[PDB]
């Protein structure tokens with residue numbers, strides 16, 4: 413499919429038994445989700461952008477369903493204002509920018 | 512052209528006759544640039560990033576070239592890790608997401 417950018421490119425993801433709305437974000441190295449429980453070990457990380465930094469928990473090898481695909485990768489969890497799907501997962505589902 | 516997402520989508524832009532590097536950022540509503548000189552009058556805008564809310568300077572109807580494509584629109588100037596090209600200009604140059 414093709415996704416226009418007149419509106420925020422929001423999609424529904426399934427992760428850890430939960431459905432969440434999230435932003436397809438080419439600017440993001442990493443995928444970042446609002447507070448939730450995830451399985452396995454984690455380590456703390458600081459990520460920064462407009463407005464400064466937030467502290468997040470990094471989980472690896474997390475299964476996600478998005479855009480009819482299943483992908484696996486790292487998910488950061490913390491006090492982000494919006495759920496963000498970053499390049500680490502966008503690549504796995506074959507998402508590209510075109511113009 | 513097609514831009515894949517295995518690396519950061521950093522591209523050359525031109526503004527005020529000068530080349531700069533900017534990140535194509537589908538998760539940004541607005542285009543936010545590193546400190547620079549722009550003509551005309553500006554007004555404040557409050558934006559909310561990952562770290563919280565901040566006020567930046569809004570310049571309207573500014574000429575800016577992105578990947579060789581000429582756009583004219585709003586650019587915000589404020590503290591950002593990198594120049595980001597947001598949806599307001601991504602739409603002008605006919606950029607979409609595809610999978």
Ligand SMILES: CC(C)CN(C1([C@@H](O)[C@H](Cc2ccccc2)NC(=O)O[C@H]2CO[C@H]3OCC[C@H]32)CC1)S(=O)(=O)c1ccc(N)cc1
Pocket residue numbers: 437438439440441442444459460461462493494496534536537538539540541542543558559560561562591592593595597
């Ligand atoms: C500023 C960029 C260089 C990096 N950030 C982006 C960016 O797309 C954000 C997403 C976002 C949207 C709404 C609310 C909060 C955040 N947009 C953003 O800041 O856009 C601003 C400009 O337009 C406005 O519209 C959305 C918020 C405003 C790439 C992910 S980040 O800070 O989230 C981030 C930094 C580091 C790591 N490792 C992961 C993420």
